Amino acid sequence: EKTAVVIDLGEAFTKCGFAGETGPRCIIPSVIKKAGMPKPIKVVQYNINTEELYSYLKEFIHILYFRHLLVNPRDRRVVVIESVLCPSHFRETLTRVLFKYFEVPSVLLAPSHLMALLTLGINSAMVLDCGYRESLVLPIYEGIPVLNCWGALPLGGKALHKELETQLLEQCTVDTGQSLPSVMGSIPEGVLEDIKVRTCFVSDLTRGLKIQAAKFNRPSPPPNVDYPLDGEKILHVLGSIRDSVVEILFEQDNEEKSVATLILDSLMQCPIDTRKQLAENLVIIGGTSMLPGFLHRLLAEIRYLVEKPKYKKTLGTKTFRIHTPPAKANCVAWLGGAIFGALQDILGSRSVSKEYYNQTGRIPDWCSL
Amino acid sequence: SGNKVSRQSVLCGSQNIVLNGKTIVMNDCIIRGDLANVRVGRHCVVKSRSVIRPPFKKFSKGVAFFPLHIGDHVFIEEDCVVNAAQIGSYVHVGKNCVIGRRCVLKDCCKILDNTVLPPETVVPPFTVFSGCPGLFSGELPECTQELMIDVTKSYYQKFLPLTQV
Amino acid sequence: PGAVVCVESEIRGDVTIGPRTVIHPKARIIAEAGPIVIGEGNLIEEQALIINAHPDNITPDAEKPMIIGTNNVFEVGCYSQAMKMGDNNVIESKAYVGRNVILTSGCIIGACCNLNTFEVIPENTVIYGADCLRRVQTERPQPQTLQLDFLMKILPNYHHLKKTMKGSS
């Protein structure tokens, strides 16, 4: 009858396509290309002028639906996959742009973790979404997301970018156009993403502990490979640096916090009957989880933290299984929204319509009244 | 008669070369039609330092490339390496451009400055070319492009009249 | 003898060209600093600027004579100011070789590509046109069989096209 639209906005990338198709049609990055502009500006931003955001969202949606969808969304429904705890200011702006400017029939602002759970096809699961800005945890038990049990450290893609920028600046080796360290003050983000995808090798638990021991009073430094760059300035990036950048994601000491500890804190907050099913079904999604050799380092670190005396008195013996999804780790949240929209013309009714928005005021966020 | 060919410009292969009425070949131009023919449209303005080279020998046993072409009101910008491109009428080539092997430029096109049109790149009608690797930037306006081409043709005719021999 | 040197093309200083070499119209071959060396079957296209680096300093000498390899297809408007080149190297149009270089055999430089000063390009690797030193796209340009056969076909088409141009006159 009518295949609905699926959107999954974010600061780094944006998964978008049709509901029903196994995986999206395209994934253009969040930034936009403007005429007479030095650098490309990011679309998804927080704490900034309302009318400017509205114009930025219109500009991104306009370049999206022609290239991605090849259709007017005026014919059929939309599924805007907002991550839970995405600012209400930003949701209101999205609601305005979809109804006032474009005039869609319906919209939906559903959470990312519940839809990622629909892909697995199980009702209870602990979920971790390691995106660009934050690494958010949220356990779901029998459909309902357990909200007060949660956690989100500023330790996703953006933290890894900042650490790469710091460590490369400290130890730099650029070719002539050899020596000459710290010539350029900063480096672009698109290049630094390509370095993370290709170079950064994720270490094991025993290797990670050896690196942590070396930092505070050297084993397994290799391997190292150079990275090519434009304008005839190749830089000889090292092997110990990229491993040290990955290590800060799992660094426990002096914060009592990490990607692994965040699941345990979420499990601690959850009730006793819910506890065991969440431990059995531990789902990992998001952008940072696509890194090579990540799921072992997490599961081994999780287990090491359970062996510690502080978590034995509550958790103890637990079968931590990581049931992986059908689609890739970044594109699990989108696939869930595509499942939610395509199949059920019935569950399209619960979402907010154009008729309801004009008279009322806004889509209902999880708040009072 | 009306075609204002400059003194510094060179037109190798006069029989193969072809210049329509109201043309304008700027200084230091190179219309090399030794191997193959070169067809220029009416009111076409070839800017300075433009290398109009022939695409192929046309002696290949199978799949010989198309020599050269240029539609009417063609605004060829300066330093533009035009080679093996069938330019549709009213095509606006950018400055420091580069055309590929058998590249089909459509009517009312707008090639950007410092562009590189690849081999067998069929550009669509009423569309701005963009990117380091050739791609569709956005749809161009019909009225604005026609008015700019008319203004460029009038300005080229004034320079064609005086100060070149 | 036995090299298609055009009348409009300019040569200067010492320049020893190989057999079946094709110097196109308005091609600059300024070899005043050092003795230029062109390989056999090397096609220099129109508007090309062949320069040399001033050399012979006692401590850290700057350069030596730019030796171009055999079957090297230099495209139109290509800059080659002091760069060591290998056999079967296809430099695209509007390119720019660095002040010192070591372009290996079976190469394929992109259009509008700035080749690096003091940078040796590896054997079998096609350069992307825009941002310099792009590692991607080096399979179809293999070091041989794939690129050696393609360069042999390119040398045959260049020789056939030059023979047709020489026949026309």
XYZ file of C-alpha atoms in Angstrom:
703
model
C 0.000 0.000 0.000
C 2.565 2.568 1.183
C 6.135 1.870 2.392
C 7.022 4.357 5.164
C 10.169 6.506 5.446
C 12.895 5.721 8.017
C 15.364 8.317 9.388
C 18.077 7.843 12.053
C 19.704 11.232 12.767
C 23.051 11.798 14.500
C 26.098 14.075 14.800
C 28.503 11.909 12.731
C 26.322 9.934 10.279
C 22.649 9.518 9.316
C 21.130 6.148 8.338
C 18.096 6.654 6.061
C 15.922 4.690 3.617
C 12.649 2.788 3.119
C 10.735 0.658 5.632
C 10.731 -3.029 4.581
C 14.102 -3.091 2.795
C 16.807 -5.126 4.562
C 19.246 -2.309 5.369
C 19.077 1.345 4.207
C 19.457 2.671 0.656
C 22.179 5.213 1.556
C 24.093 6.835 4.443
C 25.298 10.395 3.722
C 27.192 12.048 6.638
C 25.435 14.557 8.936
C 27.337 17.616 7.598
C 26.088 19.834 4.733
C 27.863 21.532 1.802
C 27.176 25.296 1.541
C 28.140 27.721 -1.249
C 30.697 30.308 -0.081
C 31.737 28.505 3.114
C 35.259 27.452 4.269
C 34.242 24.359 6.307
C 31.134 22.102 6.227
C 28.761 22.735 9.168
C 27.172 19.895 11.191
C 23.352 19.683 11.104
C 22.620 17.941 14.429
C 23.594 20.497 17.113
C 22.337 21.393 20.613
C 22.042 24.701 22.545
C 21.759 27.120 19.597
C 19.212 29.531 17.973
C 15.783 28.065 17.058
C 15.310 29.703 13.635
C 18.875 28.735 12.607
C 18.338 25.054 13.570
C 14.988 25.083 11.719
C 16.759 26.317 8.553
C 19.612 23.788 9.034
C 17.105 20.897 9.344
C 15.183 22.063 6.229
C 18.494 22.230 4.320
C 19.462 18.688 5.410
C 15.992 17.216 4.756
C 15.884 18.857 1.282
C 19.255 17.346 0.224
C 18.185 13.995 1.791
C 14.790 13.011 0.284
C 15.760 13.743 -3.362
C 19.023 11.738 -3.201
C 17.977 9.009 -0.715
C 14.249 8.403 -1.168
C 13.380 9.775 -4.666
C 9.847 10.706 -3.564
C 7.599 13.150 -1.683
C 7.004 11.965 1.916
C 3.538 13.674 1.601
C 2.114 10.307 0.405
C 3.185 8.141 3.390
C 4.437 7.923 7.005
C 7.860 8.720 8.537
C 9.866 7.115 11.391
C 12.377 9.566 12.938
C 14.649 7.374 15.091
C 15.733 9.807 17.805
C 18.089 8.402 20.448
C 16.504 8.637 23.918
C 17.767 11.705 25.844
C 18.062 13.649 22.545
C 17.136 17.202 23.697
C 13.411 18.127 23.735
C 14.379 21.451 22.102
C 15.826 19.469 19.161
C 12.722 17.217 18.970
C 10.369 20.239 18.896
C 12.442 21.690 16.027
C 12.244 18.359 14.129
C 8.464 18.277 14.722
C 8.107 21.850 13.382
C 10.180 21.176 10.223
C 8.288 17.945 9.380
C 4.769 19.447 9.842
C 5.039 23.214 9.133
C 7.421 23.270 6.138
C 7.007 19.893 4.404
C 3.536 18.877 5.729
C 3.972 15.099 6.150
C 0.959 12.881 7.047
C 2.546 11.394 10.200
C 5.790 11.312 12.212
C 7.249 9.186 15.027
C 9.883 9.970 17.687
C 10.565 6.467 19.056
C 13.690 5.347 20.994
C 16.760 3.672 19.438
C 17.314 0.891 22.022
C 13.793 -0.578 21.823
C 13.962 -0.715 17.999
C 17.450 -2.297 18.115
C 15.801 -4.888 20.399
C 13.065 -5.538 17.766
C 15.836 -6.661 15.342
C 16.967 -9.451 17.712
C 13.317 -10.499 18.212
C 13.545 -10.884 22.006
C 11.492 -8.969 24.600
C 14.220 -8.537 27.283
C 17.766 -7.202 26.685
C 20.557 -5.027 28.098
C 21.556 -2.632 25.277
C 24.645 -0.446 24.659
C 24.767 2.187 21.878
C 28.285 3.603 21.360
C 27.666 6.563 19.020
C 29.671 9.704 18.204
C 28.981 12.015 21.161
C 27.998 9.608 23.964
C 28.024 5.878 24.788
C 24.487 5.330 26.128
C 23.250 2.263 28.085
C 19.552 1.374 28.539
C 18.146 -2.014 29.675
C 14.801 -3.175 28.258
C 12.745 -5.850 30.060
C 9.687 -7.365 28.319
C 9.205 -4.423 25.909
C 9.301 -1.541 28.412
C 12.634 0.332 28.695
C 13.783 0.528 32.342
C 14.578 4.250 32.415
C 16.181 5.087 35.814
C 18.631 2.227 35.239
C 20.982 3.939 32.762
C 24.390 5.452 32.031
C 26.200 7.576 29.438
C 29.848 8.661 29.656
C 31.276 11.233 27.198
C 33.376 8.424 25.732
C 32.315 7.634 22.148
C 33.706 8.705 18.766
C 34.329 12.359 19.719
C 36.493 11.351 22.719
C 38.587 9.062 20.464
C 38.979 11.932 17.943
C 40.189 14.310 20.686
C 42.689 11.701 21.963
C 44.007 11.093 18.407
C 44.416 14.876 17.964
C 46.324 15.095 21.287
C 48.642 12.080 20.809
C 49.503 12.864 17.149
C 50.344 16.477 18.125
C 52.655 15.313 20.961
C 54.517 12.761 18.789
C 54.471 13.982 15.154
C 56.648 12.954 12.167
C 55.728 14.686 8.867
C 57.606 14.481 5.531
C 59.103 17.463 3.664
C 57.515 19.379 0.767
C 62.592 15.143 7.347
C 61.588 16.005 10.949
C 59.393 19.174 11.390
C 56.929 18.144 14.166
C 53.814 20.199 15.076
C 53.774 22.323 11.890
C 49.982 22.246 11.469
C 48.068 23.043 14.679
C 44.986 20.926 13.907
C 43.767 18.369 11.334
C 40.354 17.765 9.663
C 37.704 15.400 11.076
C 36.984 13.421 7.870
C 40.660 12.415 7.617
C 40.726 11.519 11.344
C 37.655 9.259 10.870
C 39.436 7.435 8.009
C 42.484 6.918 10.284
C 40.277 5.382 13.042
C 38.592 2.995 10.563
C 41.855 1.739 8.996
C 44.781 2.074 11.449
C 43.430 1.711 15.017
C 43.935 -1.910 16.135
C 41.989 -2.773 19.318
C 44.031 -4.655 21.946
C 43.169 -7.645 24.161
C 42.587 -7.512 27.951
C 46.104 -8.764 28.813
C 47.645 -6.316 26.305
C 45.521 -3.469 27.744
C 46.672 -4.205 31.314
C 50.309 -4.273 30.104
C 49.826 -0.850 28.434
C 48.254 0.557 31.648
C 51.199 -0.808 33.684
C 53.645 0.813 31.215
C 51.934 4.245 31.444
C 52.592 4.305 35.223
C 56.082 2.773 35.638
C 56.332 -0.744 26.448
C 55.425 -4.435 25.857
C 54.079 -5.250 22.355
C 54.602 -1.861 20.606
C 54.174 -3.108 16.985
C 52.759 -2.847 14.417
C 53.270 0.620 12.865
C 52.350 1.918 9.369
C 52.416 5.417 7.808
C 49.279 7.261 6.630
C 49.190 9.131 3.288
C 47.887 12.742 3.181
C 47.211 15.498 0.607
C 49.568 18.277 -0.486
C 52.668 16.026 -0.445
C 52.884 15.749 3.381
C 52.885 12.058 4.387
C 53.076 11.524 8.180
C 54.738 8.452 9.740
C 52.139 7.563 12.409
C 53.226 5.021 15.062
C 51.756 1.729 16.343
C 51.920 2.368 20.104
C 49.970 5.650 19.676
C 46.798 4.184 18.093
C 46.701 1.429 20.765
C 47.032 4.090 23.509
C 44.125 6.064 21.950
C 41.907 2.926 22.049
C 42.980 2.212 25.680
C 41.355 5.381 27.168
C 37.894 4.012 26.236
C 38.456 1.171 28.774
C 40.408 3.244 31.367
C 38.921 2.600 34.837
C 41.146 4.365 37.356
C 40.315 7.656 39.108
C 36.832 7.981 37.535
C 35.581 4.449 38.431
C 33.993 4.553 34.951
C 34.408 3.074 31.457
C 32.379 1.461 28.623
C 32.515 -1.910 30.458
C 31.702 -0.503 33.936
C 28.657 1.375 32.519
C 26.849 -1.938 31.806
C 27.566 -3.137 35.383
C 26.235 0.154 36.838
C 23.083 -0.244 34.707
C 22.750 -3.869 35.913
C 23.269 -2.739 39.556
C 20.381 -0.227 39.287
C 17.983 -2.858 37.819
C 15.735 -5.022 40.063
C 16.418 -8.623 41.150
C 13.877 -10.500 38.947
C 14.912 -8.503 35.838
C 18.663 -9.002 36.564
C 19.420 -12.418 34.989
C 17.606 -11.964 31.629
C 19.422 -8.640 31.021
C 22.777 -10.322 31.769
C 21.993 -13.170 29.325
C 20.956 -10.787 26.504
C 23.643 -8.077 26.263
C 23.284 -6.266 22.903
C 26.071 -4.033 21.507
C 25.236 -1.497 18.751
C 26.490 1.890 17.480
C 29.424 3.405 15.606
C 32.343 2.689 17.972
C 31.383 -1.029 18.133
C 32.301 -1.428 14.409
C 36.036 -1.180 15.366
C 38.038 -4.391 14.691
C 38.382 -6.744 17.692
C 36.095 -4.728 19.994
C 33.555 -7.308 21.261
C 36.249 -9.495 22.919
C 37.928 -6.605 24.696
C 34.511 -5.542 26.052
C 33.355 -9.042 27.118
C 36.751 -9.803 28.719
C 36.723 -6.414 30.519
C 33.108 -7.025 31.662
C 34.144 -10.410 33.107
C 37.256 -8.929 34.803
C 35.048 -6.295 36.516
C 32.633 -9.027 37.738
C 35.612 -10.917 39.275
C 36.442 -7.771 41.334
C 35.180 -7.895 45.007
C 32.957 -4.778 44.637
C 30.689 -6.464 42.022
C 30.819 -10.060 43.418
C 28.505 -9.203 46.361
C 25.657 -8.168 43.993
C 26.234 -9.784 40.571
C 28.424 -12.865 41.202
C 28.193 -15.771 38.732
C 26.476 -14.614 35.508
C 26.348 -15.978 31.936
C 27.236 -12.885 29.871
C 26.193 -13.857 26.316
C 26.356 -11.279 23.476
C 23.555 -12.163 21.022
C 24.616 -10.321 17.828
C 22.079 -8.806 15.355
C 21.439 -9.613 11.639
C 22.659 -6.260 10.230
C 25.961 -4.490 11.029
C 26.616 -2.885 14.444
C 26.135 0.747 13.325
C 22.927 -0.044 11.398
C 20.927 -2.038 14.009
C 18.859 0.937 15.257
C 17.723 1.775 11.702
C 16.735 -1.838 10.880
C 14.488 -1.917 13.969
C 12.642 1.230 12.871
C 12.267 -0.279 9.386
C 10.731 -3.415 10.975
C 8.442 -1.224 13.139
C 7.194 0.912 10.203
C 6.906 -1.528 7.270
C 4.950 -4.391 8.794
C 2.432 -2.666 10.997
C -0.001 -0.182 9.504
C -1.723 -0.693 12.898
C 1.216 0.519 15.044
C 1.400 3.584 12.759
C -1.815 4.758 14.493
C -0.198 5.189 17.957
C 2.287 7.731 16.511
C 1.461 11.452 16.215
C -0.371 12.723 13.097
C -0.632 16.146 11.400
C -4.252 16.594 12.589
C -3.168 16.019 16.219
C -0.102 18.334 16.058
C -1.826 21.561 14.890
C -4.574 21.639 17.552
C -2.515 20.233 20.475
C 1.002 21.751 20.239
C 3.687 19.031 20.305
C 4.533 15.296 20.240
C 4.445 13.952 23.847
C 7.949 13.422 25.297
C 8.428 11.212 28.383
C 7.674 13.933 30.959
C 4.883 15.053 33.346
C 1.207 15.010 32.214
C 34.109 36.708 -41.713
C 32.543 37.475 -38.314
C 34.825 35.047 -36.429
C 37.510 37.105 -34.636
C 40.582 34.840 -34.583
C 43.526 36.332 -32.648
C 47.068 36.703 -34.032
C 48.677 34.837 -31.105
C 46.114 32.002 -31.474
C 46.967 28.964 -33.634
C 44.611 26.859 -35.793
C 46.483 23.758 -36.996
C 44.597 21.785 -39.667
C 42.427 24.469 -41.284
C 40.409 22.006 -43.420
C 39.618 19.843 -40.371
C 39.028 22.914 -38.155
C 35.622 24.625 -38.294
C 34.511 28.063 -37.025
C 30.904 29.311 -37.288
C 29.647 32.914 -37.529
C 30.196 35.437 -34.704
C 32.982 33.288 -33.156
C 35.762 34.508 -30.833
C 39.153 32.784 -30.468
C 41.160 34.547 -27.725
C 44.958 34.952 -27.537
C 47.254 31.918 -27.047
C 44.510 29.485 -28.191
C 45.438 26.107 -29.730
C 42.813 24.594 -32.059
C 44.912 21.579 -33.087
C 42.878 19.660 -35.701
C 45.740 17.685 -37.262
C 44.451 14.158 -36.580
C 40.697 14.916 -36.556
C 38.126 17.655 -37.222
C 37.036 20.374 -34.766
C 33.524 21.875 -35.064
C 32.792 25.211 -33.325
C 29.214 26.525 -33.009
C 27.835 29.980 -33.830
C 28.458 32.737 -31.237
C 30.922 30.459 -29.362
C 33.569 32.289 -27.282
C 36.856 30.374 -26.899
C 38.818 32.102 -24.100
C 42.605 32.525 -23.781
C 45.035 29.612 -23.223
C 42.359 27.109 -24.387
C 43.791 23.806 -25.692
C 41.308 22.544 -28.316
C 42.941 19.170 -29.069
C 41.502 16.386 -31.290
C 40.125 13.340 -29.346
C 41.240 10.485 -31.619
C 42.965 9.647 -34.895
C 39.630 8.093 -36.022
C 41.668 5.239 -37.585
C 40.779 2.563 -34.986
C 39.437 -0.736 -36.376
C 36.667 -0.796 -33.734
C 35.212 1.882 -31.417
C 36.878 5.077 -32.692
C 36.294 8.186 -30.538
C 34.402 11.301 -31.687
C 36.916 14.004 -32.880
C 35.420 17.244 -31.451
C 32.248 19.353 -31.239
C 30.795 22.600 -29.874
C 27.202 23.902 -29.865
C 26.037 27.487 -30.404
C 26.495 30.144 -27.676
C 29.234 28.021 -26.028
C 31.048 30.001 -23.298
C 34.441 28.261 -23.104
C 36.373 29.795 -20.176
C 40.115 30.549 -20.013
C 42.745 27.774 -19.701
C 40.079 25.122 -20.498
C 41.523 21.869 -21.901
C 38.631 20.970 -24.225
C 39.206 17.484 -25.686
C 36.807 14.847 -27.089
C 33.674 16.610 -25.735
C 30.412 17.083 -27.665
C 29.288 20.358 -26.075
C 25.538 21.016 -26.306
C 24.460 24.520 -27.361
C 24.642 27.124 -24.549
C 27.162 25.027 -22.541
C 29.038 27.171 -19.983
C 32.494 25.626 -19.461
C 34.335 26.697 -16.287
C 37.831 28.195 -16.036
C 40.727 25.687 -15.917
C 38.326 22.867 -16.917
C 39.123 19.445 -18.423
C 36.876 17.376 -20.735
C 37.208 13.569 -21.001
C 37.059 10.971 -23.789
C 33.581 10.926 -25.425
C 32.014 13.163 -22.733
C 28.428 14.133 -23.660
C 27.674 17.682 -22.448
C 23.911 18.383 -22.573
C 22.029 21.598 -23.431
C 22.054 24.471 -20.889
C 24.848 22.893 -18.787
C 27.070 24.778 -16.313
C 30.549 23.309 -15.742
C 32.273 24.658 -12.604
C 35.787 26.143 -12.449
C 38.711 23.700 -12.027
C 36.432 20.747 -12.922
C 37.422 17.409 -14.490
C 34.793 15.675 -16.649
C 35.765 11.962 -16.957
C 35.667 9.680 -20.051
C 32.147 8.716 -21.240
C 30.545 11.117 -18.717
C 27.008 11.880 -19.943
C 26.044 15.157 -18.231
C 22.276 15.902 -17.976
C 20.481 18.985 -19.415
C 19.949 21.959 -17.050
C 22.349 20.859 -14.290
C 25.420 22.363 -12.583
C 28.504 20.099 -12.637
C 30.515 19.844 -9.385
C 33.116 17.932 -7.362
C 36.714 16.810 -7.913
C 35.236 13.595 -9.376
C 32.340 14.536 -11.696
C 28.873 14.649 -10.099
C 25.527 16.489 -10.118
C 25.609 19.557 -7.828
C 22.126 20.931 -8.500
C 19.536 21.900 -11.117
C 20.228 25.234 -12.870
C 17.694 27.935 -13.904
C 16.830 28.378 -17.607
C 16.242 32.165 -17.552
C 19.424 33.057 -15.609
C 21.746 30.941 -17.806
C 20.307 32.331 -21.077
C 20.671 35.957 -19.885
C 24.324 35.385 -18.871
C 25.114 33.792 -22.267
C 23.532 36.761 -24.107
C 25.600 39.256 -22.062
C 28.812 37.272 -22.725
C 28.093 37.199 -26.491
C 27.605 41.000 -26.597
C 30.844 41.672 -24.658
C 32.879 39.294 -26.873
C 31.621 41.058 -30.041
C 33.012 44.422 -28.823
C 36.477 42.932 -28.170
C 36.240 41.044 -31.501
C 35.804 44.376 -33.391
C 38.882 46.275 -32.108
C 42.542 45.687 -31.146
C 43.304 42.217 -32.652
C 45.407 41.427 -35.755
C 67.157 10.292 -34.974
C 63.886 8.328 -35.165
C 61.861 10.550 -32.815
C 58.805 12.653 -33.747
C 60.020 16.105 -32.661
C 57.488 18.828 -33.556
C 58.415 22.172 -35.157
C 56.467 24.230 -32.584
C 58.064 22.266 -29.692
C 61.046 23.841 -27.886
C 64.227 22.122 -26.636
C 67.140 23.558 -24.615
C 70.438 22.226 -23.221
C 71.473 18.560 -23.274
C 68.554 16.237 -24.141
C 69.057 12.614 -25.274
C 65.675 11.195 -26.370
C 65.088 7.464 -26.969
C 63.748 5.602 -30.045
C 60.121 6.182 -31.167
C 59.760 9.230 -28.858
C 56.896 11.666 -29.579
C 57.352 15.364 -28.715
C 53.999 17.137 -29.246
C 53.368 20.812 -30.263
C 54.303 23.636 -27.835
C 56.162 21.220 -25.496
C 58.915 22.791 -23.350
C 62.044 20.655 -22.783
C 64.252 22.973 -20.707
C 67.296 20.864 -19.742
C 69.721 23.723 -18.967
C 70.577 22.634 -15.392
C 71.313 18.966 -16.218
C 71.335 16.562 -19.211
C 67.756 15.335 -19.791
C 67.081 11.652 -20.570
C 63.865 10.449 -22.259
C 63.090 6.718 -22.553
C 62.217 4.770 -25.707
C 58.573 5.072 -26.820
C 57.925 7.978 -24.410
C 55.143 10.334 -25.579
C 55.397 13.971 -24.416
C 52.011 15.644 -25.047
C 51.252 19.289 -25.918
C 51.849 22.205 -23.499
C 54.138 20.041 -21.292
C 56.857 21.689 -19.156
C 59.924 19.456 -18.666
C 62.200 21.177 -16.110
C 65.326 20.204 -14.148
C 66.610 20.956 -10.636
C 69.950 22.772 -10.197
C 72.347 20.146 -8.802
C 75.884 19.113 -7.680
C 76.327 20.723 -4.231
C 79.065 19.036 -2.144
C 77.060 18.543 1.070
C 73.480 17.191 0.471
C 73.395 17.705 -3.326
C 69.927 18.768 -4.494
C 69.405 16.682 -7.649
C 70.604 14.805 -10.731
C 69.445 14.548 -14.414
C 65.745 13.589 -14.713
C 65.685 10.121 -16.329
C 62.265 9.293 -17.833
C 61.418 5.598 -18.331
C 60.416 3.787 -21.530
C 56.760 3.747 -22.683
C 55.924 6.720 -20.406
C 52.677 8.448 -21.462
C 53.009 12.095 -20.373
C 49.595 13.744 -20.919
C 48.887 17.300 -22.121
C 49.692 20.209 -19.779
C 51.747 17.939 -17.484
C 54.561 19.378 -15.330
C 57.673 17.221 -14.758
C 60.274 19.369 -12.967
C 63.036 16.989 -11.770
C 61.381 13.617 -11.054
C 62.862 10.123 -11.520
C 60.346 7.982 -13.452
C 59.998 4.245 -14.162
C 58.932 2.316 -17.267
C 55.216 2.262 -18.215
C 54.117 5.318 -16.185
C 50.942 7.151 -17.301
C 50.976 10.744 -15.999
C 47.551 12.372 -16.533
C 46.766 15.881 -17.818
C 47.447 18.960 -15.637
C 49.684 16.918 -13.265
C 52.739 18.231 -11.379
C 55.801 16.149 -10.422
C 57.724 17.099 -7.259
C 61.191 18.680 -6.959
C 62.559 15.194 -6.192
C 60.772 11.891 -6.903
C 60.990 8.154 -7.600
C 57.948 7.068 -9.629
C 58.083 3.257 -9.886
C 57.027 1.115 -12.869
C 53.367 0.452 -13.735
C 52.141 3.784 -12.329
C 49.020 5.784 -13.225
C 48.932 9.404 -12.011
C 45.517 11.107 -11.814
C 44.437 14.360 -13.472
C 45.295 17.560 -11.537
C 47.515 15.532 -9.150
C 50.428 17.159 -7.280
C 53.143 14.469 -7.043
C 55.355 14.739 -3.963
C 58.747 16.392 -3.454
C 61.100 13.853 -1.823
C 58.562 11.005 -2.165
C 59.070 7.639 -3.894
C 55.818 6.275 -5.357
C 55.647 2.446 -4.978
C 55.500 -0.064 -7.853
C 51.952 -0.680 -9.142
C 49.734 2.072 -7.685
C 47.212 4.368 -9.420
C 47.093 7.909 -7.989
C 43.705 9.519 -7.293
C 43.426 12.907 -9.019
C 42.673 15.309 -6.145
C 44.186 14.776 -2.655
C 47.841 13.668 -2.928
C 49.266 10.263 -1.912
C 45.913 8.371 -2.077
C 46.665 4.688 -1.295
C 43.349 3.340 -2.677
C 43.031 1.858 -6.187
C 46.226 -0.170 -6.799
C 44.894 -3.630 -7.857
C 43.988 -3.058 -11.530
C 47.378 -1.229 -11.820
C 49.325 -4.306 -10.640
C 53.111 -4.193 -11.066
C 52.751 -6.327 -14.199
C 50.529 -8.661 -16.221
C 47.741 -6.166 -15.530
C 49.571 -2.836 -15.861
C 52.436 -4.064 -18.094
C 49.866 -5.441 -20.577
C 47.778 -2.236 -20.327
C 50.852 0.008 -20.774
C 51.922 -2.114 -23.780
C 48.435 -1.553 -25.256
C 48.706 2.170 -24.388
C 52.169 2.348 -26.027
C 50.744 0.661 -29.186
C 47.805 3.115 -29.338
C 50.189 6.056 -28.743
C 52.562 4.808 -31.479
C 49.626 4.180 -33.862
C 48.151 7.644 -33.150
C 51.588 9.292 -33.552
C 52.129 7.378 -36.829
C 48.747 8.641 -38.107
C 49.672 12.199 -37.024
C 53.080 11.866 -38.740
C 51.364 10.586 -41.914
C 48.973 13.567 -41.936
C 51.723 16.162 -41.287
